[PDB]
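FAQ
Q: What does a multi-component entry look like?
A: The components come first, one per line:
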Amino acid sequence: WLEGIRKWYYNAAGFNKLGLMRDDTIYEDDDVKEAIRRLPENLYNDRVFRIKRALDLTMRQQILPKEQWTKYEEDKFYLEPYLKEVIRERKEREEWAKK
Amino acid sequence: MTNIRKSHPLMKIINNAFIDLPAPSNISSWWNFGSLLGICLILQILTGLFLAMHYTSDTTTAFSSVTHICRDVNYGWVIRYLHANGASMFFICLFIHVGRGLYYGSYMFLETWNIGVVLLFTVMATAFMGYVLPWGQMSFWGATVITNLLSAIPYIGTDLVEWIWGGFSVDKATLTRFFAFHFILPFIITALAAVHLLFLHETGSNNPTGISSDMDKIPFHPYYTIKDILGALFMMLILLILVLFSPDLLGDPDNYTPANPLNTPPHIKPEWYFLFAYAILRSIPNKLGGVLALVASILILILMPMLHTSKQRSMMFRPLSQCLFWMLVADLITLTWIGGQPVEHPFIIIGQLASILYFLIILVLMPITSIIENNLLKW
Amino acid sequence: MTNIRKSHPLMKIINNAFIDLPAPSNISSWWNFGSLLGICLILQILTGLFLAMHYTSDTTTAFSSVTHICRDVNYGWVIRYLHANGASMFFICLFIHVGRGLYYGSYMF
Amino acid sequence: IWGGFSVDKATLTRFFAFHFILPFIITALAAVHLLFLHETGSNNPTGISSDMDK
Amino acid sequence: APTLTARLYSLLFRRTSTFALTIAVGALFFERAFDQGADAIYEHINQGKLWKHIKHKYE
Amino acid sequence: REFGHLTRMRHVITYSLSPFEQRAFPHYFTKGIPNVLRRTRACILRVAPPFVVFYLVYTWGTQEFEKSKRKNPAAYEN
Amino acid sequence: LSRFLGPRYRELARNWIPTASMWGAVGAVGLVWATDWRLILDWVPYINGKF
Amino acid sequence: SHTDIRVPDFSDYRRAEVLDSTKSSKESSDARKGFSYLITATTTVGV
Amino acid sequence: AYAAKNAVSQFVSSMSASADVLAMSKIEIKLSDIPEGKNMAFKWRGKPLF
Amino acid sequence: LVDPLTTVREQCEQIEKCIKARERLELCDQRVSSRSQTEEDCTEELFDFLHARDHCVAHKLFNSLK
Amino acid sequence: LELHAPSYPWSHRGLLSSLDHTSIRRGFQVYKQVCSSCHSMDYVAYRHLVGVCYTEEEAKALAEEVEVQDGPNEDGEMFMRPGKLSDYFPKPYPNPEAARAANNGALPPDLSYIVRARHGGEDYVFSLLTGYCEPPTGVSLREGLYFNPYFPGQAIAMAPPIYNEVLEFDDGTPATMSQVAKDVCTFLRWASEPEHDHRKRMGLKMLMMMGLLLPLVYAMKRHKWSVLKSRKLAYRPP
Ligand code: HEC
Ligand code: HEM
Ligand code: HEM
Ligand code: HEM
Ligand code: HEM
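Then the predicted structure of the entire assembly, as C-alpha cells:
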C-alpha cells in the first residue's frame, strides 16, 4: 500500500538510474559533513566512487544499464545512523544552550 | 622561477577566477547562461556607449536624436537594434538563470543568491529607465504609470513621486535623470557581478545532480571556456536574428510616434520582461496592495532558501517538485500573456488566479510537496 | 568561531585594504594626498552625476543647460562650482603625488 | 575623433559620453593601483624598509 | 604518401607563427570571397528589385 | 579551494584518451538519437503537462474575449 | 526557532532590550532631524523657531 | 596488483588511422593533427 | 552631522523641482477664447487639463 | 481604367464565406432599418464580411498589380 | 470592435527579399503629388533618395522644384531659396495647430514612421487607403468624418485620397487605386526602414557565416571535451 507508492517514488527519482543510493543524494549540510567524516573508510570510498561515477554519467547524459540500477530493497542507508547521532548531539548542545 | 600566471597578482586573480578555477564536470548548458549574462552586459555597455555618442537627452531632441542614429549615423541602426534586442536577450538569460538556480537548488549559496536578487533589481531598473530614453509615446506613458505606482506608498508618496519626476509629471527633468541613471547603473551592475563571482568562488559551482563534486573537478580553461564560447556564438545567432531579420519583433510599434502628453496611446503596456509583474500588479485592485505584490514577486526569491524543506538540493531526483516547478514556469508565461492583454472580463480572473497560483506554488505547495517527498524516501 | 572582519570575503578584502594593512609609522602628510585623490574622484563622480541630471549634450542646449544648472536647479551652483574647482584640486593632488613619488623613490614600485 | 570636418555637435556628444565613462575606468585602474601597492607595501620618507615599525 | 592534411600540418600548422600567418592571409582572401559570394546570392534573389539593377534606365 | 586539496579520494583509476587519437563525434547519430529519445520520454511526462494547461487557457481566454466583444442580439431585440 | 525559545535567550533579550530601545530612540531622532520632519519638530521647543 | 589492471579498449572512439595496433601512430600523426588544426584554423578565419 | 545634513540636503533638493518648473505651477486660461460646447484642453503642471 | 481591386473584390462575393456573411449583413441591416429607434448597428456584421473578403482579396490582388 | 488588416503578399516580406525600387520611385511620386499637401515627412531628406529611387541629378532637380525658407540674410529677414539635397521634405503646415485648423481639427500624422508606428505596418496602411466604404446602417458620421472599417473607430477624418488616375506615374504604370496604394505603401516602408536592403544583406551574410562557424566551433568543443567524453573509470579497492 504505502510501500507501493514509496517504490514508485524510488523508481521516479533517478538516483537508482545513476547507480547512486539514497544517502548519496542527501544535501551536504554541516551535520551531513560530520556524518560523512565519521564514516568507516570502506563506506566512504564506496560513496565517493558512486558519486564520481554518477557525475560522469550525468556529464555524458547517459544512464547506467538496467541490470546495474540500484534496487529499492537492496538500497542500504549507510549514513542514517551516523547522521542521526550527529543530529542528536547537536540537539543536546542546543538544549544545553537553551537553559 | 615561477609561473607568471600563478605569481603575478592581477594574473593570479584572473587565473583563479577563470583559468584554473575548479569546476564540476557535469554542469550542463543551463550553466552557460551566467557567462551569457556577462557577454550581454558587456555588449550592452559598449552598444549603449556608442549610442550615447549620438543621443541628446533633451525632450526637444531625444526622439530626433534616435532617428538620427537610425538613419544618418553609419551603421547606427545596427547598434540601436543591437541594444534594444540585447536588453530582451539579457532578460531572457536572467530568467533562465534564476530558473536554473531554483530548479537545481543553487539558492543554498546564500550570499550569491542575495547579490543576484540585487542584480536583478538593478537590471530591471536600468531597463525601465532606458526604455524612457527614446521618448516615444509608449516610453512616456509607461514611465507615467510605473512612476505613478509609487504614489500608493502611504505618507511620503506624492513627495517621493515628484522627487523622482523632478516636477509635477514626467518631463524633461525626468528624461535627463533617467539618462544619467541608465548610464551609471550598468557599471554598478558590473561591480556587483564581481562581488557575485567572489561569493560563488567561495563555495564553488553547483552541479545538476546537486551533490558535491569535489571528487570530480575539471579545469575551466581547457573545457568550459570553449563551451561558453559556443554558448556565446549561439546567443549571437539568436540576437543577430532578432537584430537583422526581425528588428521590431519584441517592440511595440507605438514607440515610433513622438511622445504626446495630451494623448494616451491605444494600449499602455510595459516591455515583455516586465509584463508578469505588470499583470501581478493589475490583479490586486488596491493600489498599495498592487505595489506590494509587485515587490513581493521578486523578493520571494530572497525567501526561497528558507522555504527549502527537501533533503536533496537539486530537483533532478524530485519528480513532484519538477512538476510544481514547470507549473510555476507555465504560470509565469500565463502572467506575461495576461499583462499583454487588456483588463477585461476574461483576463481579469485569469490574472488573479495566476497570481494566487504563483505565490501559492512558491510559498506553500513546493515546501509541502518536498516534505511529502522526504516521507516517501523513508526520511 | 572567527571574526567576520577577517573571515567574510568582502570584509576580508576591506580589512586587508584599509583596516589591518601594515603601514609605516613615519609616512608624512605627503602620503595623505593619495587618499585625497580618491576622495576627489568619488566627489567628482557624485557631483558629475548630479550635474548630468540637468546637462544636455546638444550644441543648441549645452550652454543654456549650464545656465539652467547655475540659476534654476536648487543649489545647482554649488554642484557646478564644486565640480569645476574639484578638478583643479584633483590636479593639484595629482601633481603633489607625482612629486612625492619622485622625491622619495616611490617610483621603484 | 571630431566626428566631422571640425569640432561640432558630434564632437560635443562624443566628449560627453567619454567624460561620463572614463572616471569609472579610472576607479578600476586605481583599484589595480592599490593592489600593486599593497603587494609591496608603502615606502616611507626615509626610504628604508619599515617592516620593523609597521 | 603524405596526406593533404599531413602536408598542411608540417608546412604551415606546426609552428604557431606560420599557423597565425595562414589564418591572417586566409582571412584576407576569405573576406573577398565570402563578400562577393554573398552579394551575388543577394543580387540574384533580389534581381530587378535593386537600384544597381535599375540604375541604367535613369542615368 | 585550490586544485590540490579539494577532497580526499582513494583507489579510483581513470583512463583518458587524447583528443587527437579519438574521433570528435563518435556515433553522434547512431547513439545520440536513441539517447535523446530516452531523455525526451522521461522529461516530457513532467515538463509538458503544465504547458499544455496554458495552451488550453490561452485558447479559452482568446475565445471568451472574442465572444464578449460580439454583440448580444437580445440587448437590441425588442 | 524552537532553539531560541529558551529562558537563557529570554535573559539575553532582557539584557539587550534597553540598548535596543536606546538605538530606536537614536534612529527616531536621526530621522526627525535629517528630514526636518515638521510634524514632530513642531512640539520640540526652540526647534519650533524654524518653519 | 598493478599488473592485474589492464587498459580498457577505446577502439570505438579511436580514429580509423590509429585503430590498427600494428601501425605506429607517428605516420598518421601529421594527418590527424592537420585535421584538428584545420578545423581550428577555419574557425579562426571566420571569427 | 550638521555638515553632512547640509550637503545631502543640498544634493537631494538639487534633484527636487527647479525654480523654472515651479514657475509654471499656476496658469491663466482665457475663458473668452473657449467656445461653448468645446472642451479646450491645456497642459497644466505638465498634465492634460480639461 | 479598370481597377484590379474592384475585379478581385467581386470574386470574393462568389466565395461561400462572403456569401454567408453578406446574407447576414443584409438581414441585420433590414432589422435596424425596420426598427424606428434602435441603437443597433451593422458594423459587427460588416466586419465579418470585409474580413472574409479582404483575406481572399489579399491572396490574389498583388498578382494583378504590377 | 476592430478589423485586422490582411497579410498581403508584399515583395519585401521574403526573409531575404527587399523593396522594389521601381515601386519606391513611383511611391515617392504619390507622396509628392498627393499625400504632401497633408502629412509631413520631417525625417526623410532628398539626399536619402540619391541612392534609392532617383539619381543625384534627379534628386537635385526634385529638391530644387520646391522652395524652402533659409536662415536670416543681412538685415535678418527670412528668405525663400531654390532648395538643396540637404533639405528635408517640406512640411505642408507651419505648426500642428495650423494643420488641425486646415483639416477639421485632425492632425495629419508624419508619414516618416507611419508604417513602423501603426500596428499591421504597410498592410494596415494599404487596407485603410483602399478600404473607404459606405457607412453601415445606424452609423452617423459627423460631417467631416469618413467611413473606413480599418481606422480605429471607423471615423477617419480624411476623404478617400487615392482614386484611379489621381496621378500619372512617369514609368507608364496604369495609375489604379490599388496600384497607387501599393506604390505609396512601398515608399512608406522604405521611409520607415531605409536600412531594409542592407539589413537583409547583413542577414544573409550572418546566416552563412554562422552556418560556417557553429559547426566548426562545435567540432572544436567536442574535440577538446572528447578527453572526458571517452574517459573510463574503474574502482579498485585493495
Ligand atoms: C489632406 C488633409 C490629406 C490627404 C490627401 C491624405 N491624408 Fe492621411 N490623414 C489626414 C488627416 C487630417 C487625418 C486624420 C484622421 C485621423 O484622425 O486618424 C489622416 C489620417 C491618416 C492615417 C491614420 C492616422 C492614425 O490613425 O494614426 C494614415 C496612416 C494616413 N492618413 C496616411 C495617408 C496616405 C497613405 C494617403 C494617400 C496615399 C493619405 N493619408 C491621404 C490628411 C490627409
Ligand atoms: C547581471 C546579472 C548576473 C550575472 C553577470 C551573473 C553571473 C554569474 C556567473 C558567471 C555565474 C557562474 C555559473 C554560471 O555561469 O552558471 C553565476 C552563478 C550563479 N548566479 Fe549569477 N549572474 C547574474 C544574475 C544572477 C541572478 C539574478 C541570480 C539569482 C536570482 C543569480 C544567482 C546565481 C546563482 C545561484 C549561481 C550559482 C550557479 C551554480 O550553482 O553553478 N545570478 N552567475
Ligand atoms: C547593461 C545593461 C543595459 C540595458 C539592459 C540597457 C537597456 C536599454 C533599453 C531597453 C533601451 C531602450 C532601447 C529602445 O527602446 O530604443 C536603452 C536605450 C539606451 N541605452 Fe541602454 N542599456 C544598458 C546599458 C547601457 C549603457 C552602459 C549605456 C551607456 C551610455 C546605455 C545607453 C543607452 C542609450 C543612450 C539609450 C538611448 C538610445 C536608444 O534608445 O536607442 N545603455 N537601453
Ligand atoms: C586619480 C589619480 C590617483 C589616485 C586615485 C591614486 C591613488 C593612490 C593611493 C590611494 C595611494 C596610497 C596613498 C599614498 O601612498 O599616498 C597611492 C600611492 C601611489 N601612487 Fe597614486 N593615485 C593617483 C595618481 C597617481 C599618479 C599620477 C602616479 C604616478 C605618476 C601615482 C603613483 C603612485 C605611487 C608610486 C604610489 C606609492 C606611494 C608610496 O608608496 O609612498 N599615482 N596612489
Ligand atoms: C576626475 C573626474 C572629473 C574631472 C577631473 C572632470 C573635469 C571637468 C571639468 C574641468 C569641467 C569643466 C567645468 C566648467 O567649465 O565649469 C567639467 C564639466 C562637467 N563634467 Fe566633469 N570631470 C570629472 C568627472 C565627471 C563625471 C563623473 C561626470 C558625470 C557623471 C561629469 C560630468 C560633467 C558635466 C555635466 C560637466 C558640465 C558642468 C559645467 O558645464 O560647468 N564629470 N568636468
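Q: Is there any commentary attached?
A: Sometimes. For this entry: Residues 9-40 of chain D form the longest helix (32 residues).
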